[model samples]
Target: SMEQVAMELRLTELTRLLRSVLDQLQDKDPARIFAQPVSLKEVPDYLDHIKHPMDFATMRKRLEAQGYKNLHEFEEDFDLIIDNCMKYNARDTVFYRAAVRLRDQGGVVLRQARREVDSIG
Candidate 1:
């Protein structure tokens, strides 16, 4: 139990560090960009329009170098980061908001897919 808790804490710290890096990479002014709260309903379209600050390959390499041995490990940390961002109203940051939306939608899609597979089987 102690080991599990420690691991969770480490992942949370890693998520915070990653967010800081992304914040520095953001091109737009956070204050101006998030002056008005963007509707959650519009998140999909907004995510589609914005270009991600980093590419997948580079991110994967960086995380791998940081000790994330597998995709699931990285994804778990990423999802934690997104959830924390939303909890803190990191709306001023475009990427955080977009990530939260994408994570939420992806969960829904995954659940639906699982249900379909189960029904078919």
Candidate 2:
């Protein structure tokens, strides 16, 4: 009990950091395509190729359920979502294009968030 209630603060910080990235990602995407889950009917190979699927709303559900134990886990989840997108959707397609944009911008958002949250001085 000496000094690690700091742990919980970091946990909530991690949650918000992830949540904020999703909010910004969703904000930049108007069609809300990246906002939902991936399925097999439209792109029949999606599930077969990318076994570990991820999406904005699903991550938020996990966030609310305290599913992430660390920021890196959440961070990788974001990475994986885009990874799946780039894998399944053609590079010139909407899903791939948006995934590219989102990954670039999302990293910037995460970096800024880290800088702000790290400023405890």
Candidate 3:
């Protein structure tokens, strides 16, 4: 279900898509692609307000099936973390900086969950 629900898009692929679209319009003006400048926006000040459709209750239920009953305790922090992930564009310097922090936090959560399962076994 996760695989079906998600489509990963890398920055390189996004750049290529833009380049191809520009090429289609090249006949009208050869220098159009290089001439049009692009810039990334500044990261938002408040990232915690962003919403994701992956409802916490639904995720909690799924985790509960794995014998983790208190997944609801992490609902708020998880939403905030995911909010930051979506707030900044990949091209922005701040995006990767924030992503590093988020990645560490996520890694910790995953490690703890794995440890819990290992302990149960």
Best by TM-score: 2
Sorted by lDDT, highest first, which candidate order results? 2, 1, 3
TM-score of 3: 0.29
List candidate 3 stretches off by more than 4 Å: 1-49, 52-69, 72-80, 117-121
lDDT of each: 0.47, 0.77, 0.38
Error at 113, model 2, angstroms = 2.5
* Least well predicted 10-residue stretch by lDDT in candidate 2: 112-121
Give the range where candidate 3 is weakest over 10 consecutive residues by summed lDDT. 31-40
Which residue pairs show collisions in model 2?
Answer: none
lDDT, model 3, position 73: 37
Pairs of colliding residues, candidate 3: none
Off by over 4 Å in 2: 1-6, 116-121
lDDT of 2 by residue, 1-121 (tens): 5357777777777677667766876776677777778757777767668889988889889998767876667778888888988988898898899888888878877787667656731
Best by lDDT: 2
User: 1-121 in candidate 1: lDDT tens per residue?
Assistant: 9998887766655644544433332223233332233444866564453333223334445554555533355445445434544654457776566655556655654454445434633
Candidate 3 lDDT, 1-121, residue by residue in tens: 6653332223333334323332332233232221221222432442344433332334334333432223333334344434544553463655445445554555555455545434643
Identify the superior model by lDDT, candidate 1 or candidate 3. Answer: 1
